[PDB]
Amino acid sequence: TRAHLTEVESRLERLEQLFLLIFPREDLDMILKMDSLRDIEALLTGLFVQDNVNKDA
Amino acid sequence: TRAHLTEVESRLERLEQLFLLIFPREDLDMILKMDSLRDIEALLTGLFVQDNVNKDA
Numbered sequence: 001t002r003a004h005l006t007e008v009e010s011r012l013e014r015l016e017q018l019f020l021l022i023f024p025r026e027d028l029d030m031i032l033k034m035d036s037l038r039d040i041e042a043l044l045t046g047l048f049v050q051d052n053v054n055k056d057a
Numbered sequence: 058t059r060a061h062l063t064e065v066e067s068r069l070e071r072l073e074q075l076f077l078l079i080f081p082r083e084d085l086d087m088i089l090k091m092d093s094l095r096d097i098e099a100l101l102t103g104l105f106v107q108d109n110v111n112k113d114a
Binding site for chain 2: 002003004005007008009010011012013015016022028029031032035036040041044045046048049050
């Protein structure tokens with residue numbers, strides 16, 4: 001019992017804080033832009049959706 | 058004595074693969090839903106946007 005964790009833990013953990021393919025650096029739009037196919041902004045840009053829905057039923 | 062990395066590395070690294078507040082389990086919509094304020098689906102649901110833009114200029 002004189003090693004493990006602490007350093008290494010802070011290591012892969014530090015890698016966990018750096019992320020890989022989640023947080024590039026800034027801008028919180030590339031996410032929803034890469035996940036959404038604009039089928040909403042499109043379904044509306046062409047079908048002009050108009051109605052109520054609200055949240056939590 | 059040999060140690061560090063391997064186990065611990067796979068440890069915090071395993072924690073990195075489990076994520077914390079990024080991947081809940083399965084949705085693919087909760088992300089863009091929590092990032093986007095529906096100001097687009099709204100700006101269109103009320104202002105009915107219609108025009109060309111394309112990608113990459």
